[PDB]
Amino acid sequence: GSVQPSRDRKDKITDKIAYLKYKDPQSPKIEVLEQELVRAEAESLVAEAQLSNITRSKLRAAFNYQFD
Amino acid sequence: MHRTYSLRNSRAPTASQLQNPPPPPSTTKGRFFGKGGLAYSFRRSAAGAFGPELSRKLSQLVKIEKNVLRSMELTANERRDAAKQLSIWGLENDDDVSDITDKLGVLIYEVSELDDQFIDRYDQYRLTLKSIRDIEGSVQPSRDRKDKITDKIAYLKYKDPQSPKIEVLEQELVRAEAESLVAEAQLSNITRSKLRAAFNYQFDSIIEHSEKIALIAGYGKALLELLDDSPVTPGETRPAYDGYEASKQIIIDAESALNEWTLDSAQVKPT
Amino acid sequence: GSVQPSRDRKDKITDKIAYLKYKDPQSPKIEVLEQELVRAEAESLVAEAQLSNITRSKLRAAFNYQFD
Numbered sequence: 001g002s003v004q005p006s007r008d009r010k011d012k013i014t015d016k017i018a019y020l021k022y023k024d025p026q027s028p029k030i031e032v033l034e035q036e037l038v039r040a041e042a043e044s045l046v047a048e049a050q051l052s053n054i055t056r057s058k059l060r061a062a063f064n065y066q067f068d
Numbered sequence: 069m070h071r072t073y074s075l076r077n078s079r080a081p082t083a084s085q086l087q088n089p090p091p092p093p094s095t096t097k098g099r100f101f102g103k104g105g106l107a108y109s110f111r112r113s114a115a116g117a118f119g120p121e122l123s124r125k126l127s128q129l130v131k132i133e134k135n136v137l138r139s140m141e142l143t144a145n146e147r148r149d150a151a152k153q154l155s156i157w158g159l160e161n162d163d164d165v166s167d168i169t170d171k172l173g174v175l176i177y178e179v180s181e182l183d184d185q186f187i188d189r190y191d192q193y194r195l196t197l198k199s200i201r202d203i204e205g206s207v208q209p210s211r212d213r214k215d216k217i218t219d220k221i222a223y224l225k226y227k228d229p230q231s232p233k234i235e236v237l238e239q240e241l242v243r244a245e246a247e248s249l250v251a252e253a254q255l256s257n258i259t260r261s262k263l264r265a266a267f268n269y270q271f272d273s274i275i276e277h278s279e280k281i282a283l284i285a286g287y288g289k290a291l292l293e294l295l296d297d298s299p300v301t302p303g304e305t306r307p308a309y310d311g312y313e314a315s316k317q318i319i320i321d322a323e324s325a326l327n328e329w330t331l332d333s334a335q336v337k338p339t
Numbered sequence: 340g341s342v343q344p345s346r347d348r349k350d351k352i353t354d355k356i357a358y359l360k361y362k363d364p365q366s367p368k369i370e371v372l373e374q375e376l377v378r379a380e381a382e383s384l385v386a387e388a389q390l391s392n393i394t395r396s397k398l399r400a401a402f403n404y405q406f407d
């Protein structure tokens with residue numbers, strides 16, 4: 001639940017970039033938005049890994065304890 | 069630098085001062101500023117207390133640059149209209165005066181034309197600085213969020229160490245740190261480039277405008293050198309003035325020199 | 340005056356393509372619209388040439404006649 005908002009924000013930034021590119025290509029906000037998008041992508045790249053690292057361990061430990 | 073190297077607010081003697089004594093200060097310098105009412109002050113103050121704290125100063129600088137650029141347009145318009153008025157006034161006089169005055173008005177008329185291009189380049193430089201302002205203002209919230217997360221972790225650790233929110237908060241903190249590590253680099257990468265480019269453009273524009281103005285003034289002096297003067301006794305009649313052709317050649321040469329000049333052919337060579 | 344509507348239609352088609360790409364990339368109308376755009380471009384390529392061919396001739400002839 002804590003992990004999800006990062007991907008939410010990345011999707012929002014991507015949608016904003018896609019809309020603003022269509023509206024007018026001459027806006028000066030393309031570069032800053034692209035930099036923000038690449039920053040969010042770099043963050044999510046490690047966020048997904050740290051989310052997927054612990055699930056397969058905690059689930060296994062809990063189920064082993066329950067079965068014992 | 070008279071102010072820096074001496075506590076006096078006056079002007080230290082120099083070569084120009086030694087050659088010619090400095091003129092008295094202008095009498096039409098009133099105590100009241102009269103800086104276009106309170107609109108300038110409002111534009112100056114409102115911009116510095118609304119947006120993010122990081123980009124507060126650059127907005128003020130942009131507004132002040134806008135005021136600077138705005139003033140020169142009025143100056144150029146007034147100078148052009150002054151030239152027009154002088155040309156109008158010179159008509160009802162002698163033949164030589166009715167021509168020299170018109171030629172001088174025509175020559176003076178191009179200062180506003182140069183100032184318009186200077187203003188355009190100034191606006192370009194202002195936009196270039198505004199880009200840096202915008203990117204730094206967008207950069208700040210990431211560090212704001214990282215600081216907030218760090219403070220939350222520090223408080224929750226003190227409140228009770230047995231809370232299960234330590235691990236998730238620590239992971240969020242490390243994620244924010246990893247994001248800020250590239251955010252700071254991408255913020256610092258472009259400032260030293262955009263500032264350098266904008267200032268180089270501004271200096272090139274200043275050099276070009278100053279050299280063109282100096283050339284125009286020199287050719288104006290050359291044209292005015294033709295105006296012959298001699299005292300006349302009462303009852304005498306001055307000889308008919310015949311110098312129409314020379315002035316036309318002078319102004320044609322001025323046009324040719326102004327058009328031919330390029331940046332690479334700058335006459336001034338700094339040491 | 341007769342030449343202008345071709346470029347008007349080409350601009351309209353380009354704007355429609357640009358908007359529909361932003362709205363959703365999964366629409367099946369991208370290919371047909373792109374083909375229509377390339378057809379309009381091929382038409383305008385000769386329309387501009389045939390417009391510019393005759394102006395410099397008719398203007399010159401008319402002005403020569405007037406001066407004579």
Ligand SMILES: O=P(O)(O)O[C@@H]1[C@H](O)[C@H](O)[C@@H](OP(=O)(O)O)[C@H](OP(=O)(O)O)[C@H]1O
Nearest residue numbers: 092093094095096097098099100102146150
């Ligand atoms: O003392 P005041 O009320 O402010 O008026 C000034 C001065 O007393 C004269 O009236 C005038 O010089 P002239 O009589 O020669 O025109 C001058 O105009 P100027 O500043 O344009 O020279 C005024 O600024």
